[PDB]
Every structure is written in C-alpha cells, then in structure tokens.
Amino acid sequence: KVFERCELARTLKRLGMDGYRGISLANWMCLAKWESGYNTRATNYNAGDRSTDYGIFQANSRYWCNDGKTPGAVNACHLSCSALLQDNIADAVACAKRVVRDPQGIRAWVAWRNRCQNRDVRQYVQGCGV
C-alpha cells in the first residue's frame, strides 16, 4: 500500500510514534518519505552485503527481521521480514520503535541524517490535523 501523506501521519500518531524516545512525528514522516516514499511493500536488495531492506521504514534483514537468506543476521524485532510488507503497519511501527531504543536513536537511519536532520520538517505534518 502507498500511504497518502496525512493518512500516514494520523496512523503513526495513533500508533504512538509522536515523541517516541524523543522523536517528533514530523521526523518519522520525513524518515518514511525518504526510505520508502510511504510504500509498505518497498524492498531493496543490497548486493554488497546480501541484506534486504523491508517496508515503510526499510528495516535491514541483517539486524531487524529474519528473511533466512541474510548471512550472520539477527532478528532484533523478532519478526519475519514478510511482516514488514503488510498493508497494516503495526509490526513495521513496533520494529521501528525497537530500532530507536538503541543509543543511535533516529540516527540509525542514514537517510534521516541526509534528508531530515537539522531541517525544517514541519512540511511533513502540516495540515494533517495531528
């Protein structure tokens, strides 16, 4: 499923992402936009290390979910990577919450540093009623 901007913003708020571990909703919106373009079925193969990024938040199969074909991988979210490809993003959200519980926080995603950090991210939630 490809979420519309405000539709996603309201969903994330309902799932308790606003201010989770100090991360504003606008930051989560900016992260999802640059990771998958709000596409829940987004998958990305990283030929260099044999891992694949799954879902709206592009969780890497080497650390977050299990796809069985990634060498020396862990499954910190304790989920099959298939779970991160559902139209329902509850699991993808629980896993993203898990990621930011580590010291790096929102920085765990390099895309966030490049496209969101130190920027005016208000535009992502403006007019959504969140």
Curated annotation (Swiss-Prot):
Q: What is its EC number?
A: 3.2.1.17
Query: Where is this gene product found?
Result: Secreted
Molecular functions (GO terms): identical protein binding; lysozyme activity
Query: Does Signal count among this protein's keywords?
Result: yes
**Domain of life where this protein originates:** Eukaryota
| Keywords, comma-separated and alphabetical | Amyloid, Amyloidosis, Antimicrobial, Bacteriolytic enzyme, Disease variant, Disulfide bond, Glycosidase, Hydrolase, Secreted, Signal
Q: Which reaction does it catalyse?
A: Hydrolysis of (1->4)-beta-linkages between N-acetylmuramic acid and N-acetyl-D-glucosamine residues in a peptidoglycan and between N-acetyl-D-glucosamine residues in chitodextrins
A Pfam family per the record: Lys
The record's principal subcellular location, in a coarse class, is: secreted
Q: Where is the active site?
A: 35, 53
Q: Which GO terms describe its cellular component?
A: azurophil granule lumen; extracellular exosome; extracellular region; extracellular space; specific granule lumen; tertiary granule lumen
Say if the entry is tagged with keyword Signal. yes
Annotated ranges, domain C-type lysozyme = 1-130
Q: Which CDD domains match?
A: LYZ_C
What are the disulphide bonds in this sequence? Answer: 6-128, 30-116, 65-81, 77-95
Q: Name one GO biological process term.
A: defense response to Gram-positive bacterium
Q: What does this protein do?
A: Lysozymes have primarily a bacteriolytic function; those in tissues and body fluids are associated with the monocyte-macrophage system and enhance the activity of immunoagents.
The protein's assembly and partners: Monomer.
The family this protein is said to belong to: Belongs to the glycosyl hydrolase 22 family.
What is the disorder linked to it?
Amyloidosis, hereditary systemic 5: A form of hereditary systemic amyloidosis, a disorder characterized by amyloid deposition in multiple tissues resulting in a wide clinical spectrum. AMYLD5 primarily affects the viscera, and the predominant clinical features are renal dysfunction of varying severity, and intra-abdominal bleeding. Inheritance is autosomal dominant.
What else is on record for this protein?
A: Lysozyme C is capable of both hydrolysis and transglycosylation; it also shows a slight esterase activity. It acts rapidly on both peptide-substituted and unsubstituted peptidoglycan, and slowly on chitin oligosaccharides.
Under what name is this protein listed? Lysozyme C
Q: Which gene encodes it?
A: LYZ
